[PDB]
Write a protein that binds this DNA or RNA. Structure first.
Ligand SMILES: Nc1nc2c(ncn2[C@@H]2O[C@H](COP(=O)(O)OP(=O)(O)OP(=O)(O)O)[C@@H](O)[C@H]2O)c(=O)[nH]1
Lengths: 93, 75, 94, 485, 82, 80, 70, 69, 82
RNA sequence: CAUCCGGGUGUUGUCUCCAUCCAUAUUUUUUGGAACUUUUC
């Protein structure tokens, strides 16, 4: 789909929901006490929800909060490096 | 479309020969001129005349005939 | 709801449901005409919007009669609930 | 090797809704509507269909524990092995399933998934010769693009009722991270954009021409159908017609009183942002960040929803999907907005005029059906047909005519073949049926050798009708070949 | 205010009931609706000069019931309290 | 004839029901569904009428029955 | 200009007669309401134009009413 | 709450079967949520027309059977 | 909302039978129904209370004056009730 | 075609720790237009 995903990594104290610099700029009454259904809980952003929204986009292991165990040699740490491109500066070596 | 309320209003404005039929009562009819209007079918109708139906004429004064027992209007 | 009730009460006190209320307060003997030809002479106990009534010292009057015949019958009942659509005209004999 | 298909009757997924009751609906012509779904790439069309089926059927053998849970979308319509590997839709595949609107009336509906890739526009047109109304699935992020403009033009042009779906709403909150305000502006900028192309008409969430959905997390809500669950459990019965239309579009709210006033008082959010989006975000944000204590009660106290102890432990995505689907029930919002948008007396007579001679002569008087495409369902070739009159049956002998012939329009006009079998198109499977009726799209085995591409199918006992029955045109395909090998 | 409430309060009473069509109905009121729909048990239907017909359970509608003949002993004032 | 000691109509769903109406007809059948206004869905409905002598009988089938016309309902038998 | 309710209001403390769903009545109007229930004094019961009895103080229920007249 | 869908019958002559075993005819001009009918006048069923246009109350209607198809 | 109403709505299309307060049975394709049982029907026969029958095209009936409606027995099966 | 380092689920045994749903009456439902009298059978 051509991912548009956006997160800013610098200030953790920026909120979770913000309009990124990158984005293009874009007779009768009801009874009182009637309000939205979740209006009772005041803030829709939470201290964790920034991180949680970040985790929600991650490679395999992290996006899950449950799982089984693997042997220590069934974990491939350097396999992810050579599947993605080498970049450039590196010598032929 | 011409609603019933609108029609009633028009009739009232006019002041014309209105001939009302009674609900669940064949033998009798009313004949007068519409003066009043209500949210329901009820109205006041001055110079009314009770009529025995052809299976003559009878004396009658000013009357409000109640909305529930109305059937027909014409004006 | 309470406000509405209060308003209703006020209306009753003022308008055509005042007399009945007064009668109830006094608890005098009263007669009621009814859709089915039943003259209900009785003591009123309860009263509402619908003109339903709780009745004591109840004495109905009608006529069981298959034509041509002339009989006048009436029965005493101790306590009796009544429905309002039945009621045509209530009256108070002083 | 070719396809992933179910070839044994005992393994067909059992249907909760009781198929034989569906077969009863086939007789009444007004009861059924044939609706194809069209749109650009990866808008969720096939994964939209995948919602209706799993809600319809009780157990499906092709569900892995992985596609059931969340992570991988099941794709029922993408039967072909190429489409699975190619990651794409090639050939159109539908399903016939009954679903109730919000009023609880149960209608039988025939879906056709169109492939969305531009090069397959062959089968978007083959979907506009069948679909009575169409769903046009739009991405919120990608906006309404040029290939969207041409789809609505082809629909306006072909006499087909339009209903829009704005899909992939997680990609707004989760990917872009737009605040609740910035989201509603863009829901306008799209909906405001959609109307311009549609000449002499307006769509809007309130009229229920527009549906909000995210198919990955599996929810579809229409602002009517959202209120009927929750906000209609609060305020009296007489104000709902008044409320809903007071929900979308610039109206604000203070306490109990809708006031179009600039934004005055103190707080400002439009009525849509406050009563829909913000309680939508709070569903997201809490189903991720909040504890399972706090959240378990807030679903009971507000949405009247209860999470089982299994649900309390999943994973962030599979749980979020379980919260949304448990809030937004089996989908009557789509089935509703489809039902009320199709007026057959403004359309069905005009559409057949565009597909053939306008007439009309030979009223009734004949079995008259339109052969669309020759579609490959596993191990056999079928013909996908639509019936505009009469009743097909197994064993009948019917006259068939190509649309290469109908350019022209007694003996010698006659090819003839039996109609050997008639199934209902089920995605993975095909369900056998003895007869068909006006309006429903089925699959016949045994017609295929008599034509190529489009065809007309008629059976008549009258020579007068024989003169007066109208033949279909060569079907339109929105593209021309131009690329030579 | 409401006679409905009073009716509700009257529970488990063996009572006669009289209809718009005059049918006398001897039964134990197990319950009554907010709209006067009487639910009787141990019921006995008699007409006003012909033979009797008894039944176990009868749910009579509110619009039909003209007069519910109350029990012998009953404290009315108390009942009438909210 | 025997029957349970219910509180309401709703709790005795799907029981075979005798039903009287203002016109004097007697509808008999299993209550499939009730209403706010006492309208009744009856599974296998039989209208039984009495001309002014002996029971005339008509089998109807699945019937929606309006509560206005309903007088009173009685239990004819147990379930099944 | 003249609606019914205001007419009714005006006609309080004045003679009125009522027909029913039938028997004619005749008495002085005490008061009225929105529902059109009546309360009268010096009620005389015109049984088809025959004053059968003089009841006096009465209260007529609205739904049995047919028409009002002087 | 919902409007009686009589837009099919608009501007067509209808047999309004009315209370007390009576009838009315006439072309349909309008209606409301209570099913009152406004119609351009016709006879009472040998036969005799009264009025230029007529208004029938909602309660009174047994049936409104279409004369025209 | 009323389940009988729902049932009636569902029966749309099908050949329902329909008696009134008058006692004049009809039988026809149910065209349209509303919350108030304001039924329309097509291709409809019309029996008089006395006996005689009369064919007629597109009858409308107001639920107030309707007594009882017979729906076809296929609707028993599914899927309104559960 | 195999070997080898490993794996899931189920049943049983054994071992350790602990423990015996609106609220209300003026046209579509529940505030009824019901009753009385008579003929035939
Ligand atoms: N982030 C996000 N992704 C989604 C959502 N819905 C669908 N997708 C993804 O976008 C792609 C679209 O799914 P499909 O249904 O196969 O797309 P399509 O509509 O079938 O595209 P065609 O090839 O034209 O048929 C899939 O790869 C899904 O994983 C959503 O709501 N949010």
């Amino acid at each position: 789909p051509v991912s548009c995903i956006i997160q800013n990594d610098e200030e953790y104290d920026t909120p979770a929901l913000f309009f990124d610099p990158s984005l293009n700029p874009i007779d009768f009454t009801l009874p009182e006490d009637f309000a939205p259904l979740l209006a009772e809980e005041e803030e829709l952003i939470l201290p964790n929800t920034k991180d949680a929204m970040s985790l929600y986009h991650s490679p395999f292991p992290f996006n899950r909060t449950k799982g089984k165990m693997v042997r220590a040699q069934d974990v491939a740490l350097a396999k992810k490096w050579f599947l993605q491109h080498p970049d450039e500066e590196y010598p032929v070596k | 479309m011409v609603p019933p309320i609108n029609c009633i209003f028009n009739f009232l404005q006019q002041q014309t020969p209105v001939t009302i039929w009674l609900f669940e009562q064949i033998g009798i009819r009313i004949k007068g001129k519409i003066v009043g209007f209500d949210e329901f079918m009820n109205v006041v109708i001055d110079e009314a005349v009770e009529i025995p139906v052809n299976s003559k004429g009878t004396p009658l004064g000013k009357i409000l005939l109640k909305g529930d027992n109305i059937t027909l209007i014409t004006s | 709801r309470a406000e509405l009730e209060e308003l209703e009460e006020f209306e009753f006190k003022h308008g055509p449901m005042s007399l009945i209320n007064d009668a109830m307060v006094t608890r005098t003997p009263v007669i009621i005409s009814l859709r089915n030809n039943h003259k209900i002479i009785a003591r009123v106990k309860a009263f509402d919007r619908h003109c339903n009534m709780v009745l004591e010292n109840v004495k109905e009057l009608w006529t069981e009669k298959k034509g041509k015949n002339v009989i006048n019958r009436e029965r005493f009942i101790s306590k009796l609930f009544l429905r309002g659509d039945s009621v045509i005209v209530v009256l108070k004999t002083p | 090797e070719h396809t992933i298909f179910t070839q044994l009757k005992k393994n067909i997924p059992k249907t909760r809704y009781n198929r034989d009751y569906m077969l009863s609906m086939a007789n009444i012509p007004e009861r059924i509507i044939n609706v194809g779904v069209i749109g650009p790439l990866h808008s969720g069309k096939t994964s939209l269909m995948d919602l209706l089926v799993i809600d319809s059927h009780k157990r499906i053998p092709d569900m892995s524990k992985n596609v059931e849970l969340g992570w991988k979308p099941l794709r029922y319509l993408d039967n072909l092995k190429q489409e699975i590997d190619r990651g794409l839709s090639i050939k159109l595949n539908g399903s016939t399933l009954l679903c109730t609107d919000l009023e609880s009336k149960s209608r039988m509906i025939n879906f056709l998934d169109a492939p969305g890739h531009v090069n397959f526009m062959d089968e978007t047109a083959v979907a506009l010769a069948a679909s009575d109304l169409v769903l046009i699935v739009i991405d919120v992020v990608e906006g309404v693009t040029f290939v969207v403009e041409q789809l609505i033009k082809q629909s306006i042009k072909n006499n087909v009722a339009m209903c829009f779906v704005i899909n992939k709403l997680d990609r707004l909150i989760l990917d872009l991270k737009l605040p609740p305000m910035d989201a509603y502006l863009k829901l306008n900028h799209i909906i405001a954009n959609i109307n311009s192309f549609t000449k002499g008409n307006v769509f809007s969430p309130i009229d229920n021409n527009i549906i909000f959905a995210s198919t990955k997390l599996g929810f579809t809500f229409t602002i009517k159908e959202f209120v009927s669950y929750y906000y209609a459990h609060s305020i009296p019965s007489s104000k709902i017609d008044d409320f809903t239309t007071r929900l979308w579009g610039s109206v604000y709210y203070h306490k109990g009183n809708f006031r179009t006033k600039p934004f005055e008082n103190v707080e400002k959010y439009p009525t849509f942002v406050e009563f829909i989006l913000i309680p939508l975000y709070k569903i997201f944000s809490y189903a991720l960040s909040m504890e399972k204590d706090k959240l378990k009660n807030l679903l009971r106290s507000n949405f009247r929803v209860n999470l089982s102890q299994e649900a309390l432990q999943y994973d962030p995505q599979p749980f979020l999907k379980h919260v949304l689907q448990l809030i937004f029930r089996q989908q009557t919002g789509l089935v509703d907005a489809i039902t009320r948008c199709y007026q057959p007396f403004e359309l069905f007579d005009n559409k057949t005029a565009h597909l053939s001679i306008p007439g009309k002569s030979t009223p009734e008087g004949t079995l008259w059906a339109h052969v669309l495409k020759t579609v490959d369902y596993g191990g056999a070739e079928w013909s996908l047909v639509r019936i505009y009159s009469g009743l097909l049956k197994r064993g009948d002998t019917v006259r068939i005519l190509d649309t290469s012939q109908s350019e022209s329009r007694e003996d010698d006009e006659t090819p003839s073949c039996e109609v050997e079998e008639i199934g209902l198109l089920g995605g993975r499977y095909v369900y056998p049926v003895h007869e068909a009726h006006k309006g429903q799209i089925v699959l016949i085995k045994g017609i295929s050798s008599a034509y190529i591409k489009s065809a007309t199918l008629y059976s008549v006992k009258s020579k007068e009708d024989m003169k007066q029955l109208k033949f279909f045109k060569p079907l339109d395909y929105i593209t021309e070949a131009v690329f030579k090998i | 205010m409401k006679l409905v409430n009073f009716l509700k309060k009257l529970r488990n009473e063996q009572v006669t009931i009289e209809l718009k069509n005059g049918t006398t109905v001897w039964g134990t009121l197990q319950s009554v609706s907010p709209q006067m729909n009487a639910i009787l048990t141990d019921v006995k239907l008699t007409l006003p000069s012909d033979n009797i017909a008894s039944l176990q359970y009868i749910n009579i509608r509110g619009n039909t019931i003209r007069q519910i003949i109350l029990p012998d002993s009953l404290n009315l004032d108390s009942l009438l309290v909210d | 004839i025997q029957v349970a000691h219910s509180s309401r109509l709703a709790n005795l769903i799907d029981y075979k029901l005798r039903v009287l109406t203002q016109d004097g007809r007697v509808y008999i059948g299993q209550l499939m569904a009730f209403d706010k206004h006492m309208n009744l869905v009856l599974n296998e409905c039989i209208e039984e009428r009495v001309p002014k002598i002996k029971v005339e009988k008509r089998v109807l089938g699945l019937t929606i029955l309006r509560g206005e016309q309903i007088l009173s309902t009685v239990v004819e038998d147990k379930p099944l | 200009p003249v609606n019914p309710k205001p007419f009714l209001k005006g006609l309080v403390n004045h003679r009125v007669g009522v027909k029913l769903k039938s028997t004619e009545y005749r008495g002085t109007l005490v008061s009225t309401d929105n529902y059109f229930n009546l309360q009268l004094n010096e009620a005389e019961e015109f049984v088809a134009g025959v004053s059968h009895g003089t009841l006096g103080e009465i209260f007529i229920r609205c739904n049995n009413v047919l028409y009002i007249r002087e | 709450v919902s409007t009686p869908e009589l837009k099919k019958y608009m501007d067509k002559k209808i047999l309004l079967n009315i209370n007390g075993s009576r009838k009315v005819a006439g072309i349909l001009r309008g209606y409301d949520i209570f099913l009152n009918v406004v119609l351009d006048d016709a006879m009472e069923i040998n036969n005799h027309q009264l009025g230029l246009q007529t208004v029938i109350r909602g309660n009174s209607i047994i049936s409104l059977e279409a004369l025209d198809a | 909302n009323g389940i009988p109403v729902k049932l009636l709505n569902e029966a749309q299309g099908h050949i329902v039978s329909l008696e009134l307060t008058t006692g004049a049975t009809y039988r026809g394709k149910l065209v349209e129904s509303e919350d108030s049982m304001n039924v329309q029907l097509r291709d409809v026969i019309a029996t008089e209370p006395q006996g005689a029958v009369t064919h007629m095209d597109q009858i409308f009936v107001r639920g107030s004056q309707i007594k009882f409606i017979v729906v076809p027995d296929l609707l028993k099966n599914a899927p309104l009730f559960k």
